Amino acid sequence: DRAEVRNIPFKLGMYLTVGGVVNSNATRFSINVGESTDSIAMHMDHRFSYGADQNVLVLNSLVHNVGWQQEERSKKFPFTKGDHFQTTITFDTHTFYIQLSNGETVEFPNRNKDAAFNLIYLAGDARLTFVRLE
Amino acid sequence: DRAEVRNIPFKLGMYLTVGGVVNSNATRFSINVGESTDSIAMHMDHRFSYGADQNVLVLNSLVHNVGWQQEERSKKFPFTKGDHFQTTITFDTHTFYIQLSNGETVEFPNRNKDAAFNLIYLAGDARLTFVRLE
Ligand SMILES: OC[C@H]1O[C@@H](O[C@H]2[C@H](O)[C@@H](O)[C@H](O)O[C@@H]2CO)[C@H](O)[C@@H](O)[C@H]1O
Ligand SMILES: OC[C@H]1O[C@@H](O[C@H]2[C@H](O)[C@@H](O)[C@H](O)O[C@@H]2CO)[C@H](O)[C@@H](O)[C@H]1O
Predict the structure, then answer these.
(1) What number of other Cβ atoms are within 10 A of residue B81's Cβ?
(2) Ligand lying nearest the CA atom of residue A31
(3) Of A108, A100, A50, which Cα lies nearest the Cα of A77?
(4) β pairing state of B39-47 and B56-63
(5) Is B74 exposed, middle or buried (0-12, 13-18, 19+ CB in 10 A)?
(6) CA distance B76 to B83
(7) Measured in whole angstroms, how far is the alpha carbon of residue A36 from the centre of its chain?
(8) Ligand nearest A45 Cα, by number?
């Protein structure tokens, strides 16, 4: 089903590194950090072709029983279908710090000021091959 | 609920390191590698007090809709309630190689000759604090 790391707290000051492979013919895949599939503090969607979006990163938060908040977009897109990627995430109470495979970074606000997350998962057209959370 | 890493394949030649903390007043906790909570290729139970078992490791496999197979027991028990532990596991098609916090090792047969596992989880009276699967 989806690839997930559950109930191993991702706390302030820890680093999460995930590696994986994008499917050949991928439309989009996302990495999600939050509490559940309906409560996501940092959604990072990688869009190869989705609606009018082609080769863009879209970041947002999802509030339980409320929905998606304000999207932030980045044009940094070092991803190729069929190829590996590696992403590292850390955060403090104000900011998620994301580092992409090529060393470029994206920052996204920690909107709820959360200090720990109990669910990390990947969804969509990719698979994970390794994880370090420490 | 339980701490789990799901659908990030633990394959032949990868290493899994988990760290955690044993509950004060723990009865037992286990680390489990398999396919589901009813299909476990390597169950490693840490028994502080369970029936007549006190400070013993018990290893076994669980077959779906069939049950527990032949138990193997070890007397190596460098664990203290309320304290941290660290365990590393690797395997080939014949053997699971487990290394405990103090450097001692335990080996347990890979009874189904499996080459990849899609579920790693901890159950019982402990919690996980970090994981590396690579
Ligand atoms: O914001 C993340 C969220 O986006 C949804 O798609 C949006 C799309 O980004 C936007 O440009 C359009 O106007 O509305 C769509 C629907 O809200 C995705 O459907 C969702 O999965 C998230 O990725
Ligand atoms: O073998 C692992 C399995 O053990 C069960 O407990 C056993 C116990 O080890 C044995 O000495 C006794 O005779 O029978 C019990 C029931 O089969 C646990 O209940 C189970 O959770 C596993 O840990």
Answers:
(1) 15
(2) 1
(3) A100
(4) antiparallel
(5) middle
(6) 16
(7) 14
(8) 1
Which range marks the domain in which residue A111 is found? 1-134
Domain count, chain B: 1
CB within 8 Å of B67: residues ≥ 6 apart: none
The CA distance from B1 to B22, in Å, is: 16
CATH code for the domain of B112 = 2.60.120.200
- Say whether A86 counts as a known binding-site residue: no
Nearest chain A residue to B21 by CA distance is A8
Tokens 């579920």 identify what position? Answer: B119
- Rg (alpha carbons) of chain A, rounded to whole number: 14
Give the CA distances from residue B28 to residues A72, A91, B5, B75, B127, in Å, rounded to whole numbers and listed in that order.
Answer: 46, 34, 20, 15, 12
SS3 breakdown of chain B: % helix, strand, coil, rounded to 5?
0, 65, 35
Length in residues, chain B = 134
Nearest to A131 among B3, B5, B129 (CB): B5
| Type of residue found at B10 | F
| CA separation for the pair B105, B67 (Å, rounded) | 26
